[PDB]
Design a binder for this molecule. Structure first.
Ligand SMILES: [Ca+2]
Ligand SMILES: [Ca+2]
Ligand SMILES: [Ca+2]
Length: 626
């Protein structure tokens, strides 16, 4: 490159990783020094242009030449945005004489963008353990039966005229004729989770557990809460929960762990005493009388049978949060003994809440909720359920730390690798489309939020990845290599690590086959290897992300994860045959003559003419680190 009236887009880079931003989670008094990469000698000037919410105006900061990279291929330019408490948004103007390019979260543009600016949100922190962790999601009835004494039996109780059914471990999840799918119980419990902490924390290496609901409720899924304050007896008691939490937190039995609970705060069950549709309590619920002590906890359109609910399910009546200081806001979060606080305080001290159905609870309520949660424990995580762009609950730093990454992770991964959407409908995307989808969805979020997103291949509300993949376990390998090297918390839905299959609910909640929970299962062996690799390299958790190859002919995707210390080129082959790939590691400033090691195999390579040449099997990958 040269000063030649032309900005060369291929040389340009910025994100908020360590090489480019010295303060990605600044306080009010920390200035933000930003670096923009270009090809060496390519440009004549560059400017940071930032919107300041303090004065509703743009501000321009001229940049200066900072340095070359070690390979001598690139310049870095630098400039500093001043310290203050205000939210700010920035982009770059990049000039080479009569040529101008713009650059922001969406990359380069010939025209000035007005969306996808980078974020500066002073004093907004997400928990660093969430950014750096690996999460394991457990649907408790189906993971491990640690104790038969608490098992629900066939006919133990009835709910809305149907008896419960016990089914044998490993059998079909579908209720036998006459029974109901939501009242089928395999016997998994908290004691079982406790007994399997060595599998989770050592055999795999995950350090965060996320549980589907565990509080008293008549169904097997327990999203129809009857008592927020009691562990459901099928799963244990509150003392079992305390013991489980202390064993999760222990550093003596594996890495220090964290527990995130499912907070079902949009709605209760229809059998909650506040509602009491079936008169299970002496008290009078909202369904029973318009003079009920809890009548105003719900919203009736025509009392008693037409009321607000989750998605039209009459079993899930929607809570009326009223306005600030209301009784409902009190019992859920404000009161010293609220549901949200109770589990965050001793003797529980859980590490976060996953917010079920969170889009149906307004932004004011989530802002108050954040204050309640973070006031007890500033390092307790708040992850909202949302299937789209969760910017409205994340990008001002006043509500959630992150969201369930359906839109930025689960869907594009599904469509690229399996050719199906996550509901197993036909929907395929190319490698260029995959890369574009990923970039646009990252750009929806502040960097800390991106790094804290819950990135799962499957969950309890979508079809299993291994079913979408038609049973080809190598598609799971590929998905795992991507998952464990991408931006956001890798989240393993129990069983995905061994290739568990399953269609739509309830078949996505099969009982876990413990014969497969060893490194003799090749997917488990790869999962363990990848978690070890992710835990070795901060660049994989909090590093920059740069696209390197998007090859739609050979179905090759390559990207770099890199920081001040490490440079890692991930190379993924989404074809059904091997490809030998020339990896442009020069883009990551890996020097000529240096060595890289594929951390999956231990195979070593030498960088030549900016390239590493590696053979990658179909539906597999290499993780080329130095
Ligand atoms: Ca130039
Ligand atoms: Ca049990
Ligand atoms: Ca009653």
């Amino acid at each position: 490159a040269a000063n030649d009236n032309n900005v060369e887009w291929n040389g340009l880079f910025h994100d908020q990783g360590p090489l480019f931003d010295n303060a990605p989670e600044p306080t009010s008094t920390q200035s933000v020094t930003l670096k923009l990469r270009t090809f060496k000698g390519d440009i004549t000037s560059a400017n940071i242009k930032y919107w300041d919410t303090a004065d509703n105006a743009f501000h321009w900061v001229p940049m200066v030449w900072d340095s070359n990279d070690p390979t001598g291929t690139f310049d870095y330019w630098k400039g500093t945005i001043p310290a203050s408490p205000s939210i700010k948004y920035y982009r770059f103007q990049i000039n080479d004489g009569t040529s101008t390019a713009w650059y922001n979260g969406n990359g380069p543009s010939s025209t000035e963008p007005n969306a996808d600016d980078f974020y500066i949100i002073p004093n907004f922190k997400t928990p660093d353990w969430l950014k750096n962790g690996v999460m394991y999601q457990i649907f408790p009835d189906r993971f491990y039966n640690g104790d038969s004494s608490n098992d629900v039996q066939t006919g133990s109780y009835t709910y809305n005229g149907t008896p419960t059914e016990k089914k044998a471990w490993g059998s079909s999840v579908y209720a036998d004729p006459g029974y109901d799918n939501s009242l089928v119980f395999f016997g998994g419990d908290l004691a079982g989770i406790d007994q399997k902490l060595g599998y989770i924390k050592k055999t795999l290496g995950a350090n965060i557990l996320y549980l589907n609901p565990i509080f008293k409720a008549p169904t097997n899924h327990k999203y129809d809460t009857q008592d927020y304050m009691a562990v459901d007896p099928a799963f244990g008691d509150n003392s079992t929960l305390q013991t489980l939490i202390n064993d999760i937190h222990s550093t003596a039995n594996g890495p220090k762990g964290y527990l995130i609970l499912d907070g079902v705060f949009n709605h209760t069950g229809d059998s909650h005493p506040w509602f009491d549709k079936y008169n299970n309590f002496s008290s009078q619920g909202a369904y029973e009388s318009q003079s009920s002590p809890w009548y105003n906890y719900y919203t009736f359109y025509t009392w008693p049978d037409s009321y607000a609910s989750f998605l039209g399910f009459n079993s899930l009546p929607k809570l009326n949060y009223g306005n600030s200081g209301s009784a409902v806001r009190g019992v859920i979060y404000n009161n010293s003994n609220s549901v949200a606080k109770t589990y965050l305080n001793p003797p529980y001290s859980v590490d976060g809440w996953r917010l079920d159905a969170a889009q149906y609870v307004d932004h004011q309520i989530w802002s108050e909720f954040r204050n309640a949660v973070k006031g007890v424990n500033s390092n307790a995580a708040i992850i909202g359920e949302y299937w789209g762009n969760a910017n409205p609950w994340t990008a001002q730093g006043n509500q959630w730390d992150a969201a369930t990454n359906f839109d930025g992770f689960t869907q594009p991964v599904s469509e690229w690798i399996t050719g199906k959407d996550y509901q197993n409908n036909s929907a395929s995307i190319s490698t260029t489309q995959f890369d574009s989808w990923l970039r646009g969805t990252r750009a929806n979020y502040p960097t800390n939020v991106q790094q804290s997103m819950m990135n799962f291949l499957s969950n309890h509300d979508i079809t299993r990845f291994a079913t979408r993949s038609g049973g080809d376990l190598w598609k799971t390998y590929l998905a795992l290599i991507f998952q464990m090297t991408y931006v956001g918390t890798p989240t393993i839905y129990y069983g995905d690590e061994y290739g568990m299959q399953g269609g739509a609910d309830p078949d996505n909640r099969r009982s876990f086959d413990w014969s497969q929970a060893t490194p003799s299962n090749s997917a488990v062996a790869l999962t363990q290897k990848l978690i070890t690799i992710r835990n070795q390299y901060p660049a994989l958790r909090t590093g920059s992300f740069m696209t390197l190859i998007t090859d739609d002919t050979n179905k090759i995707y390559s990207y770099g994860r890199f920081d001040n210390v490490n440079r890692i080129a991930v190379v993924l082959n989404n074809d059904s045959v091997s490809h030998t790939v020339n990896v442009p590691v020069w883009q990551l400033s890996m020097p000529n003559g240096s060595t890289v090691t594929d951390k999956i195999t231990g195979h070593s390579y030498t960088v030549q003419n900016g390239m590493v040449t590696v053979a990658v099997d179909g539906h597999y990958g290499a993780v080329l680190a130095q």
